[PDB]
Amino acid sequence: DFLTYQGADRDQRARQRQAVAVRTTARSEVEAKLSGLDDASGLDDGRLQVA
Amino acid sequence: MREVISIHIGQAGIQVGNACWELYCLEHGIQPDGQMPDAFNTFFSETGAGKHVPRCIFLDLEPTVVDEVRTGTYRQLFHPEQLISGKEDAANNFARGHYTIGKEIVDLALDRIRKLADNCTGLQGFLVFNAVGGGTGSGLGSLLLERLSVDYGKKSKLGFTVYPSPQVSTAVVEPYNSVLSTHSLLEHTDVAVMLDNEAIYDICRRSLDIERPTYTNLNRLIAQVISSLTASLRFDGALNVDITEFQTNLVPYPRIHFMLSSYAPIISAEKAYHEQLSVAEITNAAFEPASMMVKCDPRHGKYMACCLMYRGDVVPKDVNASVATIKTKRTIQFVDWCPTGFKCGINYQPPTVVPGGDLAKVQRAVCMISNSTAIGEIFSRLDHKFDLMYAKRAFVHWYVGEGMEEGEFSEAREDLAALEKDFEEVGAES
Amino acid sequence: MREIVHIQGGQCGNQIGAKFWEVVSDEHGIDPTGTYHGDSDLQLERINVYFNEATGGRYVPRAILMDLEPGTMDSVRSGPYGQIFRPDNFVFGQTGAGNNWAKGHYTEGAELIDSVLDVVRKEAESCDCLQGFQVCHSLGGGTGSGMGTLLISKIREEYPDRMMLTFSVVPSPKVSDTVVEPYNATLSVHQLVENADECMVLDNEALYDICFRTLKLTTPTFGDLNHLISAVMSGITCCLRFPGQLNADLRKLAVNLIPFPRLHFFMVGFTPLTSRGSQQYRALTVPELTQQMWDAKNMMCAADPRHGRYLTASALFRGRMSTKEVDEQMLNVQNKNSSYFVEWIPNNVKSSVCDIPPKGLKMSATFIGNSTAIQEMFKRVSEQFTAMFRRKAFLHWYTGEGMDEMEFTEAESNMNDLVSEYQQYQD
Amino acid sequence: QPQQPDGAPATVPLAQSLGLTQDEVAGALSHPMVHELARSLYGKASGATS
Ligand SMILES: Nc1nc2c(ncn2[C@@H]2O[C@H](COP(=O)(O)OP(=O)(O)OP(=O)(O)O)[C@@H](O)[C@H]2O)c(=O)[nH]1
Numbered sequence: 001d002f003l004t005y006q007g008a009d010r011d012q013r014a015r016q017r018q019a020v021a022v023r024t025t026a027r028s029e030v031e032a033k034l035s036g037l038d039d040a041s042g043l044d045d046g047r048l049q050v051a
Numbered sequence: 052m053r054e055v056i057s058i059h060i061g062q063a064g065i066q067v068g069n070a071c072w073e074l075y076c077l078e079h080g081i082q083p084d085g086q087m088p089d090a091f092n093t094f095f096s097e098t099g100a101g102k103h104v105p106r107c108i109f110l111d112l113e114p115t116v117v118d119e120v121r122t123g124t125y126r127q128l129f130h131p132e133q134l135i136s137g138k139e140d141a142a143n144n145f146a147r148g149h150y151t152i153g154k155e156i157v158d159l160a161l162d163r164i165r166k167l168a169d170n171c172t173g174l175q176g177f178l179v180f181n182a183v184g185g186g187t188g189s190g191l192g193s194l195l196l197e198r199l200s201v202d203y204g205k206k207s208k209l210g211f212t213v214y215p216s217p218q219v220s221t222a223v224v225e226p227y228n229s230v231l232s233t234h235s236l237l238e239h240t241d242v243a244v245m246l247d248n249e250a251i252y253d254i255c256r257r258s259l260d261i262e263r264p265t266y267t268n269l270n271r272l273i274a275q276v277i278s279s280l281t282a283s284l285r286f287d288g289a290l291n292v293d294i295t296e297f298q299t300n301l302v303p304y305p306r307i308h309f310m311l312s313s314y315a316p317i318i319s320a321e322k323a324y325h326e327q328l329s330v331a332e333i334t335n336a337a338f339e340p341a342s343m344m345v346k347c348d349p350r351h352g353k354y355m356a357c358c359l360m361y362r363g364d365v366v367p368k369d370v371n372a373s374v375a376t377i378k379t380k381r382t383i384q385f386v387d388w389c390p391t392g393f394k395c396g397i398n399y400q401p402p403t404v405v406p407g408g409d410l411a412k413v414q415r416a417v418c419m420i421s422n423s424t425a426i427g428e429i430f431s432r433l434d435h436k437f438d439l440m441y442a443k444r445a446f447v448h449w450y451v452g453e454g455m456e457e458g459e460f461s462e463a464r465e466d467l468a469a470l471e472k473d474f475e476e477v478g479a480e481s
Numbered sequence: 482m483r484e485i486v487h488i489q490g491g492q493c494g495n496q497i498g499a500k501f502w503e504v505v506s507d508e509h510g511i512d513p514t515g516t517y518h519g520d521s522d523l524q525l526e527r528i529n530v531y532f533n534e535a536t537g538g539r540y541v542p543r544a545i546l547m548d549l550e551p552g553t554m555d556s557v558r559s560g561p562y563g564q565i566f567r568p569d570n571f572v573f574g575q576t577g578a579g580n581n582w583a584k585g586h587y588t589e590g591a592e593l594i595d596s597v598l599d600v601v602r603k604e605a606e607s608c609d610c611l612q613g614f615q616v617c618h619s620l621g622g623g624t625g626s627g628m629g630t631l632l633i634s635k636i637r638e639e640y641p642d643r644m645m646l647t648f649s650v651v652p653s654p655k656v657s658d659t660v661v662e663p664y665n666a667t668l669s670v671h672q673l674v675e676n677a678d679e680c681m682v683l684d685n686e687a688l689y690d691i692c693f694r695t696l697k698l699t700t701p702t703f704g705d706l707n708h709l710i711s712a713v714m715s716g717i718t719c720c721l722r723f724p725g726q727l728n729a730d731l732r733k734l735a736v737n738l739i740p741f742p743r744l745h746f747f748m749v750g751f752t753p754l755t756s757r758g759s760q761q762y763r764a765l766t767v768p769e770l771t772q773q774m775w776d777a778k779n780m781m782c783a784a785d786p787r788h789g790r791y792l793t794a795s796a797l798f799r800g801r802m803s804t805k806e807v808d809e810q811m812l813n814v815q816n817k818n819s820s821y822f823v824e825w826i827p828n829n830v831k832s833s834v835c836d837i838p839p840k841g842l843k844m845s846a847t848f849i850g851n852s853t854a855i856q857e858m859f860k861r862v863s864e865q866f867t868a869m870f871r872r873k874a875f876l877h878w879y880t881g882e883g884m885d886e887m888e889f890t891e892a893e894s895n896m897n898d899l900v901s902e903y904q905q906y907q908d
Numbered sequence: 909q910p911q912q913p914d915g916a917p918a919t920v921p922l923a924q925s926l927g928l929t930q931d932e933v934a935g936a937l938s939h940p941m942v943h944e945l946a947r948s949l950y951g952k953a954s955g956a957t958s
Pocket residue numbers: 060061062063064066067112113140141142143144148182183184185186187188213220221222248266267269270
């Protein structure tokens with residue numbers, strides 16, 4: 001209570017790190033779904049089926 | 052922390068800054084009263100609990116536009132003492148804005164800069180906004196940049212100056228103010244991004260399909276250019292471009308610091324559905340000569356250094372495929388001594404859209420700020436008009452009486468003419 | 482019982498090594514928390530080669546992370562496998578080089594160097610036998626070039642007898658993120674020839690080509706390119722971390738691949754690369770890994786090995802295999818086309834076998850190639866630099882930070898001397 | 909306008925058919941979004957109806 005400002009800046013750093021962690025996990029999920037796309041992922045299968 | 056200060060000078064400064072901070076509060080979710088319902092540290096300073104203040108100063112000699120912000124929809128947002136007003140305007144008088152009535156208001160302006168400098172931990176640059184066609188934008192814009200260089204050494208200054216157009220312009224003595232202010236911003240601005248209202252008139256007419264654009268419509272897409280320029284600092288991206296990265300990759304010489312600007316997707320929502328906006332499709336739209344925001348022909352000159360700021364869902368591969376097709380195009384010309392003239396900036400956040408703006412929700416956007424030798428035609432056309440002005444010495448008594456000496460037009464004459472000489476020989480091959 | 486000290490510099494270094502420590506910790510079985518979950522006892526046998534013992538059973542990597550902008554360090558810390566590093570090893574600045582080699586090497590890099598040698602020297606004497614220092618950085622940028630190559634120069638005079646593996650990506654003609662990249666690359670290679678023991682030459686134009694035509698990846702990201710380098714950086718020191726039939730340390734590779742002291746730049750290829758659609762068609766045998774090993778498409782450098790003769794080659798094989806037909810296949814390609822190999826080195830190719838394959842693969846191999854074709858990527862940066870230097874473009878962002886034009890002339894003096902020696906052995 | 913079918917329900921007017929409040933019908937033109945719509949309609953001279 002007497003050193004509340006030290007706790008305030010520690011909590012600010014913790015909240016900053018948590019927010020960066022959440023944003024990076026969301027971006028990691030997005031780039032993983034982007035990187036999963038390949039020839040094994042179904043593309044042009046409709047073209048093969050219609051031919 | 053990546054923290055910058057924006058300075059808006061003159062009538063164009065206050066009106067552009069109204070559109071910029073409308074985009075800036077909407078990007079970070081800031082409500083107009085200042086309540087959040089830490090990417091905002093670039094522009095918004097967190098004061099106490101739940102309150103955010105702009106890192107800007109609105110100084111203008113006329114009060115009628117400063118009190119408009121004080122009575123508009125953003126009264127609770129801006130700190131009221133950062134907004135600087137004056138008793139009377141300079142009124143297209145470079146002598147007034149720099150010598151007579153610039154003295155008593157620049158002391159209050161530097162005090163707000165001093166208070167904002169100690170508040171920010173690491174300052175990255177000054178985003179100065181002015182119009183060189185007006186008395187306050189030139190004269191107070193010149194005097195403030197003189198004081199910024201002495202007080203704050205080696206800190207970058209981003210200059211987005213509104214420059215007079217050859218055909219369409221709103222005042223008679225603009226060739227006097229634009230030529231005199233050229234001497235100040237040549238030696239003192241580290242980056243001078245030109246702006247031309249007639250080109251932005253033409254950009255709005257053919258792309259947005261808005262055939263009666265007003266000053267609100269022009270400032271809204273100016274706000275997108277300034278936001279996408281600084282979007283790398285605020286939000287994490289694939290290839291971050293700091294403010295200091297622009298000077299090291301755009302200007303090869305100290306006297307050459309003028310760059311064009313272009314925003315690639317300017318598309319209405321009725322145009323957005325039928326148009327497939329791909330990265331290669333919008334990179335070609337960036338380097339379109341009629342899509343430049345300054346009325347000049349880049350085909351006439353040679354490109355010297357280019358910067359591409361991509362936003363949204365842009366993978367780092369197809370930007371390179373777009374760049375390779377740009378290099379192979381023979382219509383765009385590069386200077387021989389700059390084989391790698393591209394700076395690429397990719398940010399993952401798509402640009403927000405203001406409710407009420409003409410722009411549509413687009414996933415990907417490009418802001419192109421490039422250096423070319425075709426911008427010697429920009430100063431040459433105003434050099435012809437100032438030659439007619441000073442030959443018969445019209446409107447000089449409004450300048451001589453208010454402090455300025457007669458030879459101050461002369462010293463600004465070959466200085467802008469030496470800029471013509473400098474731009475001609477640099478682009479020349481050897 | 483030898484140790485590798487790992488240093489990552491700049492945005493490229495902090496992003497490559499994020500995938501590097503993801504691969505290695507998953508290979509030895511360390512969880513993102515920092516404990517052990519390995520199935521086999523051979524994983525825990527060599528932990529010291531990349532990880533430090535900590536109190537409570539924690540395994541902390543020997544990684545020193547540095548840059549001049551703290552934005553990149555927040556990404557590597559907050560990602561997966563990002564809390565295993567020491568927080569005190571996160572040494573960083575706040576100004577940023579801004580793609581300036583003058584800034585990264587002289588002005589604001591130098592104050593941060595005194596912080597990183599405190600971290601490295603505390604970590605160097607922490608371990609008992611220094612095998613070498615491994616560094617990963619970029620040559621096109623300024624944060625990893627200027628600060629990275631002063632770090633290489635300073636730890637050379639402190640530890641001269643230890644190895645120096647440098648993983649460096651170089652500027653490309655086709656892809657160009659930086660305008661001033663010939664200035665930063667040439668001034669970094671000139672500071673690399675007399676300091677670095679051996680250099681892993683990488684580029685972005687080859688990884689994008691490999692990810693496109695081989696892996697059939699429609700949307701390759703940097704993280705996809707980082708995985709290709711991260712597989713390599715484990716494959717170079719694979720025999721350090723595991724037993725094998727024929728083992729190879731770093732100095733095993735250095736004595737074989739370096740005929741003359743200034744010819745320490747190598748091209749790298751990773752063998753078992755196949756798309757998931759084409760995975761079922763491939764039969765995993767040593768001739769199929771070898772035929773992908775020697776193909777120029779699978780190389781991760783801009784240099785085409787068909788243009789210049791192979792001065793010396795290498796082989797870092799991983800997995801259970803036969804030492805006859807591994808050794809037979811290395812000498813079979815030496816006789817199929819002997820024009821692409823140098824004549825006065827009989828048995829150019831060196832081979833080594835490790836019996837522990839990586840995760841998800843039964844057989845794998847890593848190629849290190851000392852070829853004179855790597856003069857192509859040195860002429861290409863130098864021809865870009867000599868075009869800019871004649872007009873003295875973009876120079877005041879270098880000469881304003883305290884250097885003369887004499888350092889640029891001596892940078893091209895060593896750059897033109899490096900290609901002069903490589904061209905001479907091609908003849 | 910086509911003639912309504914026989915036995916038509918004699919449909920109620922639109923405002924309180926779809927449920928507009930007195931404040932909304934009084935200040936339809938006073939809303940900022942409607943003002944921006946009117947500004948863009950003024951800007952599109954002849955292409956407003958397009
Ligand atoms: N694009 C754009 N240009 C503007 C805007 N407001 C003013 N301008 C430009 O400003 C020029 C007129 O000079 P001003 O900068 O307004 O002069 P001032 O700031 O009022 O200074 P004084 O005239 O001395 O009082 C015009 O030619 C316009 O091109 C704006 O909102 N958008």
